[PDB]
Nucleic acid binder design. Structure first.
Lengths: 203, 80, 77, 67, 393
RNA sequence: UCUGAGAGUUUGAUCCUGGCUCAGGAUUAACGCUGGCGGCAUGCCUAAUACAUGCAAGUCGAUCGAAAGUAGUAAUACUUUAGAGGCGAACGGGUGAGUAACACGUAUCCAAUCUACCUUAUAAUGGGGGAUAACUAGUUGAAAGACUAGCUAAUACCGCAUAAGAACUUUGGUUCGAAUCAAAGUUGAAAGGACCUGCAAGGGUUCGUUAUUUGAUGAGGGUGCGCCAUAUCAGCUAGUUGGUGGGGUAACGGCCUACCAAGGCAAUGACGUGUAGCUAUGCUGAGAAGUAGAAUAGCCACAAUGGGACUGAGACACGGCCCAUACUCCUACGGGAGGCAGCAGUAGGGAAUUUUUCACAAUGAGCGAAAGCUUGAUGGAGCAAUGCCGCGUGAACGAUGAAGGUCUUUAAGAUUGUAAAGUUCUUUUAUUUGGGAAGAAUGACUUUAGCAGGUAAUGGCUAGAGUUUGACUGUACCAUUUUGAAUAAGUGACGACUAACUAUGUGCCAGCAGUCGCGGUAAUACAUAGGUCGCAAGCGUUAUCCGGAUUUAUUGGGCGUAAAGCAAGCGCAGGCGGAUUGAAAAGUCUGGUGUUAAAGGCAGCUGCUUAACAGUUGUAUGCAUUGGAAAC
RNA sequence: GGUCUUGUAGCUCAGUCGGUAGAGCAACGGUCUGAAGAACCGUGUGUCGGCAGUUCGAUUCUGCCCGAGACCACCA
């Protein structure tokens, strides 16, 4: 599916981290082994390099719910300039609209932010937008569409959102603007950029 | 013109009679934005006088465009 | 079948008749000039050649060529 | 339709060919049988492949069962 | 614009069913010929009756012959039907989508079981109040025997449940009318006047999506497939996408031209005879017998269950029982579809004359409605005409 | 500132040489499950096989005569032009059968050519004649058609003088076959209409109309070069190469003719058998390069097959003409008609292709003093998941685990899985309520004020206003506006290559397979069930082009034993080759003008919600070219 | 669009006009080379499309029809 549905399932086998703490949800001791029947012995017996490159690519793919073709387009866009591939790839990674919407604390999950963007309740440059895959730069308006402030989700998000220093906004004013660029260690360091970047010799 | 469906762009040229439209052209003489409200007509103003003195057939919008640019104003004096 | 070119055919029938009638005048006149050499007959040849040269019948370059070679061969006298 | 007599192998459920019927073929070589490099396309013609088979349900052309 | 027309009077379908040499084709030609002399022209010559091989040298039609004409009361369309075996597959289609039953009898030959089969055909489709003519009386003179023959015809129709006394029987002969004798043309006019009454109007409905049973298809140079049938419920105008259901998987197609036997129409009332031109269809999938309709139509069915009132011995049928392996034929007015019969429990054998609702196992998925008129036939005759009551598959 | 990944495969196991298959990327792809949409492109490659019906090139009354009609009381404003005259139909449209070369792309030459329109300027637009259609009447013919006698004038035709400048000879001047002012002799022009000042006259303005002056457009020839493979095709070619006299093309020429001389090309691949429209470019890669010549564009080509010419300056002319062919038809059986490789549609072939759809509303063409139509060029709507790009099928919470499938088959256990129930939440598409922009503010035409020359106007520059110009048209987009988690996911694989394993059936049957091959009943590969993963409104297999294949090795291999040194030598051309002095000019570098089209790439912007894409700006690959730089 | 013929073992075929399941591949138990294959011996494997009537039961006589396999859609 375009939306994987369960996120917990993928984090079981791949050991993927979406939010502050997902390896142990205290959900009756969820296994780090593969779901189903064979979470018994296939832990580290048959590892080869191409394999780790592959599930690292998969984990990188499932942090944002991004499909392969649009990531290939994004890598094309990255190759459309020079410099270190890691910094440009990461930068275009956060620059996706729903990611900033999530990082502001206006939505507790990237999926809710993407749904809000698609449904048209998100505004850019004083005009509503409906694409959750926008590339952004300094000076980009974001409102809350006050009709969509009574939502039980956005209220709790505004009360207890995640603070981000690369884009600054006042939580109780619900008006934001993209400010600056992030730093590498700020992003989750568990992702190895080398494997994901150089598995993509396709385009 | 070789623009796009529902949003085309036209480049103006005073081509001869027998020559096919949107094919091989004698010269490139600017272009225009006939879809939005800015009146943007980027022109060179370096060979049009020479071609008019040398022979050039104006089309329908040429009248308005070179009246806006004032070229028809100087054309009557160039004739004398 | 087009209803716009049959009138052209009927026109060019008479046009071809007239063109033949004028071309044969040049033919007979150059026959006379080649048979008898003088200035008057060749002047008549030149007159007819220029008259049909102005008309869209024979290319004026051909008339000039023929008059040039006729005066060249006349230059013997 | 071109004049060239060629051998084909018969995958699918047994045989669905009836002594000068009409068929459509696909390419593909086999090691076991020399002199044949062709297969039949089960499903798109008089041959239709489905009974107790749902894996690889692209070849052996069949319909998706409905609950 | 091949033919522009908008009918100012209702359309009616008339047909004829007769045995060989009764004058059936003779009457078919003669009615239109005499109507080409007082009323509107028909241009019905002898060359516009039969076209198939071997049917021109015999005088009988293989498929229906189509003529159409106006009248002072009702606009008629005359369809000519075959009358002999080895072609019953086509006479069933010809006579099953009519709206009348004209019987041709002659004083030169006594009534034969083919007349009984004609009454049978009138019985299946359910056409009461027929019009019978003692046509072709221009043979060796008969003085009083003709009245006895007429009486025998009148009490002959009670074998199938049809009235005999109120039948407008008139003396006449069509061959002499075609020869050029106005005296028998007057007799044919009297036959037409009798025809004007007792004939049921074709079934008309204006709000159903669509339904039409295929009879044949015709190829037109540059246009394509012209379908033969009858728009009998609902309506169909140009520019409506149409589905195809029955005997084949559903297929979405587009209508382009609406013919009315070489005419052009905006909209045609239900029950009339016309034609429809299809877009990008194939004659291997578009075959005689299937159904075309509008999205949201009757669901296709392969198995179902229908009641039956088997015809009695007096009603033309047989009188011998049928086992459980019974696989007779079925006719939905168009095509011979074979099917198995399964018999209710607690009964081994049932004969025509006794009836229990039977489950039919059709060969192919046929789009059938609940209550559909379907004839159960085998052995070159009819044993019953039932109606669908339940669907299982 | 570019700048590449390997893996398996033989032998007991190895180190080799080496042969292949796989992991990608594109398309004009078919097949199964599928089916949500948007915007943008693509969609006869196969039979250059024939194809019904309607359109696809038509136009001018201010060109002429004349005829039909409207109406004005009979004179007649006015419409149609049924016809002769004006231009175009030669360009646009489509398709590659044929073509191995000046067919194509360029550097370049005409010292031998061309060109109506459109701009610089002179001279005239004067005076006569004749017929001539349509018409009317008549013959003939089945119809198509051919005619026989009167009719009128035409910007149609032919004379007359008009004639400086023009075309061709006589002298004085001139450039590597050439450039000019003279003096003469032969010669060659035609057409008026309209609008007005003005007693008409006399005069102007306009559309034209003729011969000279720069111009452009397009065509055409010798060019240098580059241009598919094949010597298991060795000689080829006689108007065919040379000499001259006549023509013939817009022009030099065996282009042709008449009379005389035997030449020319070819080993440094002619002649020939075959394939193929060439080029920009589509795609593989680091590149040298390979590959396909999609569509789109520049150029060549033929309109079922051949020919043969004519009007116009320009065709050997896609819906022009004369004829022979094959075929389909009419025929009263004498004779006639025909060409969808123009758009849609139909038959056949093939797996394989759009709707007999609509409008001149934007550009381009055809005409005019114009509305006006022709505009299947074009502009759009529909169909096609064919190929890209981009958004749905929900969101936050919720379980020591809801059943039921599976597995241990101890079940007092692991799974499915926070998947669900439940809470509201917002509807992108559904749903329905309103507005309908938008390309078209471009576009003619009608009036208000001066500037071109005479003012007396018409007329050309303008500025402003103006009614009117919409197929797409209820569009995409907005309105917290109506309801509603709703109106909507599969797919291939899971031994290894190659992230993805467990039970049951089946027993060298059924089958899989790209390779080791898997099955002699305990199958992680046959087939299911569960689980898993790769991808996704697209998914895997086949048809293909390259890559990895350094597997044609110049860039980047070898020839002792793996495939490979001719058994050697004498040895033409051909490639090389000791050192210097000086001039050098073919390479080598600096310089710009012509280009190298544009589009396509590469980068930067602009816009449709960003992206897809479109446009914009520059970006380069190759030959002239005039200076110079001096080692090789 | 109607024409002729066929439907018999798992396969190919036989063929009383109303009292026949006949042949060859295939399957089964084995002899046996070490085993496979071959051969040999054993002995069995058919509502003779799917229905309703004629009749004495009709596989075999008819009638519809299910399929299929060849032929023909000529006259604008």
């Amino acid at each position: 599916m375009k939306y994987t549905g369960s996120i917990f399932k993928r984090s079981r086998r791949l050991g993927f981290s979406l939010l502050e703490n997902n390896k142990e949800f205290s959900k009756g001791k969820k296994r780090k082994t593969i779901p189903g029947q064979h979470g018994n012995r296939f832990r580290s017996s048959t590892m080869s390099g191409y394999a780790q490159q592959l599930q690292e690519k998969q984990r990188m793919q499932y942090m944002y719910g991004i499909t392969d073709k649009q990531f290939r387009r994004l890598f094309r866009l990255v190759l459309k300039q020079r410099g270190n591939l890691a910094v440009n790839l990461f930068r275009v990674l956060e620059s996706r609209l729903d990611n900033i919407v999530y990082r502001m604390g206006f939505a507790p999950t990237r999926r809710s932010a993407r749904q809000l963007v698609n449904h048209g309740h998100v505004l850019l440059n004083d005009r509503t937008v409906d694409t959750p895959s926008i590339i952004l730069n300094p000076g980009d308006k974001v409102r809350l569409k006050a009709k969509t402030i009574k939502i039980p989700i956005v209220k709790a998000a505004s009360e207890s959102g995640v603070v981000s220093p690369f884009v600054e906004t006042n939580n109780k004013t619900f008006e934001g603007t993209y400010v600056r660029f992030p730093e590498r260690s700020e992003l989750p360091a568990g992702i190895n950029e080398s494997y994901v970047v150089e598995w993509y010799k396709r385009l | 013109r070789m623009g796009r469906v529902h949003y085309p762009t036209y480049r103006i040229v005073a081509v001869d009679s027998r020559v096919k439209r949107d094919g091989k052209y004698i010269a490139l003489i600017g272009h225009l934005n006939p879809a939005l409200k800015e009146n943007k007509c980027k022109i060179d103003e370096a060979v049009a006088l020479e071609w008019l003195n040398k022979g050039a057939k104006p089309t329908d919008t040429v009248r308005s465009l070179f009246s806006q640019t004032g070229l028809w104003k100087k054309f009557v004096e160039s004739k004398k | 079948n087009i209803k716009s070119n049959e009138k052209r055919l009927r026109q060019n029938i008479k046009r071809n008749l007239n063109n033949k009638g004028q071309k044969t005048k040049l033919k007979t006149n150059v026959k006379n000039f080649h048979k008898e050499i003088n200035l008057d007959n060749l002047g008549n040849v030149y007159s007819q050649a220029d008259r049909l040269a102005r008309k869209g019948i024979i290319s004026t370059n051909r008339a000039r060529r023929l008059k040039s070679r006729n005066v060249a061969v006349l230059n013997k006298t | 339709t071109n004049g060239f007599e060629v051998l084909t192998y018969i995958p699918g459920e047994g045989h669905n060919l009836q002594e000068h019927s009409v068929t459509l073929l696909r390419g593909g070589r086999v090691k076991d049988l020399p002199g044949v490099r062709y297969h039949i396309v089960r499903g798109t013609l008089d041959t239709v492949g489905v009974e107790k088979r749902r894996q690889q349900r692209s070849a052996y052309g069949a319909k998706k069962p409905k609950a | 614009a091949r033919e522009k027309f908008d009918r100012s009077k209702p359309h009616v379908n008339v047909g004829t069913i007769g045995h060989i040499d009764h004058g059936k084709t003779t009457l078919t030609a003669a009615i239109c010929t005499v109507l080409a002399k007082e009323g509107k022209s028909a241009a019905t010559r002898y060359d516009q009756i039969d076209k198939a091989p071997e049917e021109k040298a015999r005088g009988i039609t293989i498929n229906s012959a189509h003529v159409e004409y106006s009248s002072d009361k009702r606009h008629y369309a005359h369809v000519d039907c075959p009358g002999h075996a080895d072609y019953i597959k086509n006479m069933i289609t010809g006579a099953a989508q009519m709206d009348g039953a004209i019987l041709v009898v002659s004083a030169t030959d006594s009534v034969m079981p083919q007349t009984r089969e004609h009454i049978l055909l009138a019985r299946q489709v359910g056409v009461p109040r027929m019009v019978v003519f003692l046509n072709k009386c221009d043979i060796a003179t008969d003085e009083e025997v003709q009245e006895l023959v007429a009486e025998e015809v009148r009490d002959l129709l009670t074998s199938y449940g049809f009235d005999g006394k109120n039948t407008p029987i008139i003396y006449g002969s069509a061959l002499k009318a075609l020869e050029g004798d106005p005296k028998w043309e007057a007799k044919i006019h009297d036959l037409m006047n009798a025809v004007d009454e007792w004939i049921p109007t074709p079934e008309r409905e204006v709000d159903k999506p669509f339904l039409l049973a295929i009879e044949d298809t015709m190829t037109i140079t540059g246009r394509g497939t012209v379908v033969t049938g009858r728009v009998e419920r609902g309506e169909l105008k140009v520019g409506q996408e149409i589905e195809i259901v029955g005997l084949r998987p559903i297929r979405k197609a587009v209508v382009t031209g609406i013919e009315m036997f070489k005419k052009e129409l905006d909209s045609a009332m239900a029950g009339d005879n016309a034609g429809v031109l299809l877009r990008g269809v194939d004659r291997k999938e578009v075959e005689r017998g299937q159904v075309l309709a509008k999205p949201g139509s009757i669901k296709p069915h392969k198995k179902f269950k229908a009641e039956i009132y088997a015809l009695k011995k007096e009603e033309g049928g047989r009188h011998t029982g049928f086992l459980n392996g019974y696989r007779p034929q079925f006719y939905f007015r168009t095509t011979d579809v074979t099917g198995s019969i399964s018999l209710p429990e607690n009964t081994e054998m049932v004969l025509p004359g006794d009836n229990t609702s039977i489950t039919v196992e059709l060969i192919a998925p046929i789009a059938c409605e609940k209550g559909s008129k379907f004839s159960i036939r085998e052995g070159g005759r009819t044993v019953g005409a039932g109606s669908v009551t339940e669907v299982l598959e």
